[PDB]
Amino acid sequence: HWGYGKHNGPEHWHKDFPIAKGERQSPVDIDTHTAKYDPSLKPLSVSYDQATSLRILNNGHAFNVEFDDSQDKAVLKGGPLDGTYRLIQFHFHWGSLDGQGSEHTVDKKKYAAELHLVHWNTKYGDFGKAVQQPDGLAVLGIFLKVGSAKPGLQKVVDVLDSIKTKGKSADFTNFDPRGLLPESLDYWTYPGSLTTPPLLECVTWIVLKEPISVSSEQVLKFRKLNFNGEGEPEELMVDNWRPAQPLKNRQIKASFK
């Protein structure tokens, strides 16, 4: 019964998921004064022109926008990656207040939210086999700050009322994830983990330097979602982030000077 509440939050996850105290856990703090430029990194290739979104689901921890991943339609390549990684879903983590909500931090700065675009390595055939491999997933992480509205986010905002409670889903076709990207694709990269149970150490993280801006009204609608199911006492879906974990024997590399 893991979650983000008073008695089941991140500090308790290790009792059911001992890898929570592992060597390659995520998120981490990104220290911009020790991350080193790596000239061997190749430019990032984000290929989302043929993406096919299907559905949006409130899973009781966040909401997922799900894609058709049965063909190479929306893929991530280049950067630190070898091979081709297929987009399966995106989701967000956010706060109760604008000064918290991100999972990664930058020189200890917390952003209001963080977007995760989750991709799996096609050499492993399916997502469930990929998560068992150290190079199975690639997650593109994008910070959100509160300021101007993000036009490309509004179709997500407007469907949230239909998926207020745990277990609800809605059709969500023809959504273009390119409208969630910042101008620059400059990034930091390091090896890590899923940030929710089962916390598997299968992810190459690619965290963009440039945040996107969303409006106060857009974030306020995120904060009206519920962790609970229909007909249960209301528990607002806020503060669904894991804090920074020890870097241990890892280096964060920068794509940019």
Binding site, annotated residues: 91, 93, 116, 195-196
Residues in contact with Zn ion by the rule CB under 5 A: 116
Looking only at the bridges linking them, the beta strands covering 253-254 and 36-37 are parallel
Q: Return d(Cα 108, Cα 191) in angstroms, integer.
A: 19
Q: Return d(Cα 11, Cα 55) in angstroms, integer.
A: 32
Output b/e per residue, 72-100; b: 16+ Cβ within 10 A: ebbbbbbbbbeebbbbbbbbbbbbeebeb
Query: Which of 197, 203, 189 minimizes the C-alpha distance to 133?
Result: 203
Summarize the annotated binding site for substrate as residue ranges: 195-196
Q: Which is nearer to Zn ion, 102 or 218 (CB)?
A: 102
Identify the H or E element spanning 76: strand 75-78
| Cβ contact 117:90 at 8 Å | yes
Q: Which residue is nearest to Zn ion (CB)?
A: 116
What token pair was written down for 2? 């893991």
Q: Return d(Cα 112, Cα 147) in angstroms, integer.
A: 10
Q: Return d(Cα 161, Cα 124) in angstroms, integer.
A: 36
